[PDB]
Design a protein around this ligand. Sequence first.
Ligand code: 39D
Lengths: 238, 7
Amino acid sequence: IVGGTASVRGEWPWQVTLHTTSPTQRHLCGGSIIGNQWILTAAHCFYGVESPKILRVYSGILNQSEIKEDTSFFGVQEIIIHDQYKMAESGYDIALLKLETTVGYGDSQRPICLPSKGDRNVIYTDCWVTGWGYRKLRDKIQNTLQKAKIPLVTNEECQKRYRGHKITHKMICAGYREGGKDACKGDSGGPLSCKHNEVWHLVGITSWGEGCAQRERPGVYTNVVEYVDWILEKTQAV
Amino acid sequence: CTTKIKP
Ligand SMILES: NC[C@H]1CC[C@H](C(=O)N[C@@H](Cc2ccccc2)c2nc(-c3ccc(C(N)=O)cc3)c[nH]2)CC1
């Protein structure tokens, strides 16, 4: 996260750090708890991931230094990538991780609400991006989970900022015209969480952008409201 | 949450 500040423990209890153990263990992507055996994240995270056996989901983490060999984690039973997904820049950048065991909810880890189909018309003004990503273009994964408040941008305004790309209505953009605050490398897959009527909703999934926090280059996110039926299809299967 | 995820 560029231009953000340290989060407080328990501030974003749906936020997870997804690690890969191949070739060595490291943070791969962010993700969000949406159900007691489900993590919602970005499909591009899994480029070259041949098996869910190499994945570890850590919940209730503030600092990456909390993670050692003896730290508990959730194994991944299945990686479900949207079948229209080709690449982040073309959309459908959404995946579900079905966990091997159930997440016990509490003050350190709990799910975030998905948006309501009725709330596709609501105007969110309190949106935050979180993650352990870089704080500048050439950096390293941060120890402490960072946060930044960023305004949503209309699809029309985002399209002007991305000449040569097709910004679809299944994408949502966020950023300041002057730049300065944005997601950066290692934040992908994490949430764009918006507070409306005292409830937090998972509005976006960090997906792609041209650089980090540049002027007139907002971050592009998967527009979660457009995938609520896809999520329910995958999570509520008979 | 209005949108319910089955346990
Ligand atoms: N302004 C918008 C912003 C631009 C960066 C983008 C991002 O975050 N894009 C990912 C795409 C990717 C995901 C998984 C594997 C490989 C690539 C990324 N993560 C890293 C990254 C870098 C070091 C480490 C590490 N453990 O040292 C982990 C991940 C670099 N890029 C989010 C949106």
